[PDB]
């Protein structure tokens, strides 16, 4: 009545969600998940997330599905910047840092991490791209540190008027407003690729 592959490994979700350090949004981390089993309902309740939004699929119905590969993206942004991590959204983050496709099928998980990513003197280790000539294609990662040319005069790699470094630091202090505090974000992408499915839910096979 039910038949899934004989997969025994557990998916390294704890390696992603409970990592001691996350990445800057402009250089986001992508973990490729394959050949493992994952329960998405225990993940929904494993912690108290601020946003757990799914698109297309549902977390409850997600346990009944198999996928070729599942992709996990993790980074840190501001509190009121999480709304840009969604299909069809625009903004400094969606345009120049991390972009979702309009036909996005998956879930985006975010939770406050002020106690982890805020330092007293200010945590300037989390960066974000402020200047970019054009938008990002979906799932594109631009880690270039080229001096941004805002004027007609070339920059020759030196900062000045109309020549600005394209990356800026978040001022992450624990006394910030709720919208200014760091939020760790995890994006889950489900890929069906006409191939053996290797990432399934926790359903047990019969005969």
């Amino acid at each position, epitope marked *: 009545i039910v038949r899934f592959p004989n997969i025994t490994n557990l998916c390294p979700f704890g390696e992603v969600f409970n990592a001691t350090r996350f990445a800057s949004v402009y250089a986001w981390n992508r973990k490729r998940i394959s050949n493992c089993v994952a329960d998405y309902s225990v993940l929904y309740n494993s912690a108290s997330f601020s946003t757990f939004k799914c698109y297309g699929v549902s977390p409850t119905k997600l346990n009944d599905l198999c996928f070729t590969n599942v992709y996990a993206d993790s980074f840190v942004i501001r509190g009121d910047e999480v709304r840009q991590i969604a299909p069809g959204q625009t903004g400094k983050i969606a345009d120049y840092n991390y972009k979702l496709p309009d036909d996005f099928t998956g879930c985006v998980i975010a939770w406050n991490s002020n106690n982890l990513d805020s330092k007293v003197g200010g945590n300037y280790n989390y960066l974000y791209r402020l200047f970019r000539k054009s*938008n990002l294609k979906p799932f594109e990662r631009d880690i270039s540190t080229e001096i941004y040319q805002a004027g007609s005069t070339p920059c020759n790699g030196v900062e000045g008027f109309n020549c*600005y470094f394209p990356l*800026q630091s978040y001022g992450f202090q624990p006394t910030n407003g709720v919208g*200014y505090q760091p939020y760790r974000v995890v994006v889950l992408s489900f890929e069906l690729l006409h191939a053996p499915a290797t990432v399934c839910g926790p359903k047990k096979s019969t005969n």
Partner: antibody
Amino acid sequence: QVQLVESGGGLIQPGGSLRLSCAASGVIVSSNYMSWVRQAPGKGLEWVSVIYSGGSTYYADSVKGRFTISRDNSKNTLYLQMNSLRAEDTAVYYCARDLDVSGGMDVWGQGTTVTVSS
Amino acid sequence: QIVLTQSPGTLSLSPGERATLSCRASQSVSSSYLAWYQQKPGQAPRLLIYGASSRATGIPDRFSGSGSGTDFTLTISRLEPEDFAVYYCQQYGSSPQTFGQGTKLEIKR
């Protein structure tokens, strides 16, 4: 030079349309955050609209649906198409570039005056 | 949205004194997203300070800014005759960006 020169402002009645122009030199409009800021007579400053280098556009809630911001890279000019104008839209409109945390709004035009009355 | 309440309404001082302008926000604002602008009658706004403390290029040393959270300050250590104008603060960290109603710096006699 680094100048922003504005034009297109004038007199119109409620409902009419107007297109403001903002010609730039020393700064490329398609490579910067370009904003419109207005100031009603004897009042403070109010942000109106912005267009990103990548094309994203945002408007204030009071002018959303009636205003449209655009640019022409060949002419290096910025536009603000205003339709269905109202008496409260009477203000001096400024164009400016935004450097955000990297330097704020450092270049401003001289301003063009718009008057809406019947 | 975020409301910036500047105080006092008008500041009456003689050239040479120190001017202290207050900008109080209705919400906590990160110091990196506060700016100060100067406007004279009939002219366009002139950027003084961005990031609550960074001077724009061409702004003399007598202009200085400070503040964090909800309370911000623009200080002119020694007022010059050309410093009498209207000064606005501005937050640009929360959409939509907003300005204060302005403080008028007026020659006292």
